[PDB]
């Protein structure tokens, strides 16, 4: 009965997605229409800025990618994927893409602004989340992957730096830079060291299962306050990852340790989320016995924490970055490559 409503929901969702997937939105705004306020963050190929839309007065977060840099780092296909996918999705815990456009030097993606800041900031500050608090977040991730996976989508970049906290205390997943639509196996080496599944590190060809392993890492990190595999140099991390040995802090409940040992299962064929019951083995786990998935989806649950917002356009919850002026060349750069954007 509950399972059937989901299946239906999902079904209808696949239809809406396909419609956008086949005919993507394009050139919906222009740089001239916004005022650049402040850099909210930094990533590997571009930056994110707080911006204000002259005409409506709303603030948004604008992601900026430099065409040539994208090109030098071989991220063209990834960048087209990111945009094409973001424009097609629709789920309560995903950042909404508002506008997209390009110019001689860059690519722009404008989304709703999520003022609460990165989960990363708070976690590091607090040090660690109480189990129920972490379970609350994890729940949202579960449903999100449930949605995304059903669309043949693989996320590949889960980590607290990618989860923003909204006004209501809920999570918003951002950065679809490695998101891919694939029926079958994939082989690219991408992600964040601490969160990489062994198969990825082992160059074995992987599927949706890497997302579940990552969800395991995230939950451990939220509750312990440190990831399960840490070191100073990536190579050492990968070695610990591959090795298949996990230690848990004395404070984890027996339930949690059980969930975790099943998510952090080196053998894909035994890893929760990648079995006959698929997502159900997770949702059904004793650790989540308390969670009303529906209510979470509905956002009827009281968030355990609510970040402080002092006004629209308030950046208080974000770290400070050095400002770099955006420069638009007189010559069109890499036109061919980004035709579809």
């Amino acid at each position: 009965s509950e399972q059937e409503s989901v299946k239906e929901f999902l079904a209808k969702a696949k239809e809406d997605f396909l419609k956008k997937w086949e005919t993507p939105s394009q050139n919906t705004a222009q740089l001239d229409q916004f005022d650049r306020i402040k850099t909210l963050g930094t990533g590997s190929f571009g930056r994110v800025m707080l911006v204000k839309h002259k005409e409506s007065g709303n603030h948004y977060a604008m992601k900026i990618l430099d065409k040539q840099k994208v090109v030098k780092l071989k991220q063209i296909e990834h960048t087209l994927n990111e945009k094409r996918i973001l424009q097609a999705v629709n789920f309560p815990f995903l950042v909404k893409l508002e506008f997209s456009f390009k110019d001689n030097s860059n690519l722009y993606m404008v989304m709703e602004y999520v003022a609460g800041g990165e989960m990363f900031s708070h976690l590091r500050r607090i040090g660690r989340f109480a189990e129920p608090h972490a379970r609350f977040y994890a729940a949202q991730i579960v449903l999100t992957f449930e949605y995304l996976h059903s669309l043949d989508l693989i996320y590949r970049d889960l980590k607290p730096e990618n989860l923003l906290i909204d006004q209501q205390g809920y999570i918003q997943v951002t950065d679809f830079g490695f998101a891919k639509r694939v029926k079958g196996r994939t082989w690219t080496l991408c992600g964040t060291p601490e969160y990489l599944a062994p198969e990825i590190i082992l160059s074995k060809g992987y599927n949706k299962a890497v997302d579940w392993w990552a969800l395991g890492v995230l939950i451990y990190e939220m509750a312990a306050g440190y990831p399960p595999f840490f070191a100073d140099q990536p190579i050492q991390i990968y070695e610990k990852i591959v090795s298949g040995k996990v230690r848990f802090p004395s404070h984890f409940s027996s339930d949690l340790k059980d969930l975790l040992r099943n998510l952090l299962q080196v053998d894909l064929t035994k890893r929760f989320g990648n079995l006959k019951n698929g997502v159900n083995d997770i949702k059904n786990h004793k650790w989540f016995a308390t969670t009303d998935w529906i209510a979470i989806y509905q956002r009827k649950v009281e968030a355990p924490f609510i970040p402080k917002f002092k006004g629209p356009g308030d950046t208080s919850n974000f770290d400070d970055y050095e400002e770099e002026e955006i420069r638009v060349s007189i010559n069109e750069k890499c036109g061919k490559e980004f035709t579809e954007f």
Binding site: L73, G127, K159, C190, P193, G225, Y226
Partner: peptide, 20 residues
């Protein structure tokens, strides 16, 4: 403690993605 070990490690800040 492990936490203390993490705190002193070089990877307490924001972690960038790898691609290559």
């Amino acid at each position: 403690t492990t936490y203390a070990d993490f705190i002193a490690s070089g990877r307490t800040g924001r972690r960038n993605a790898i691609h290559d």
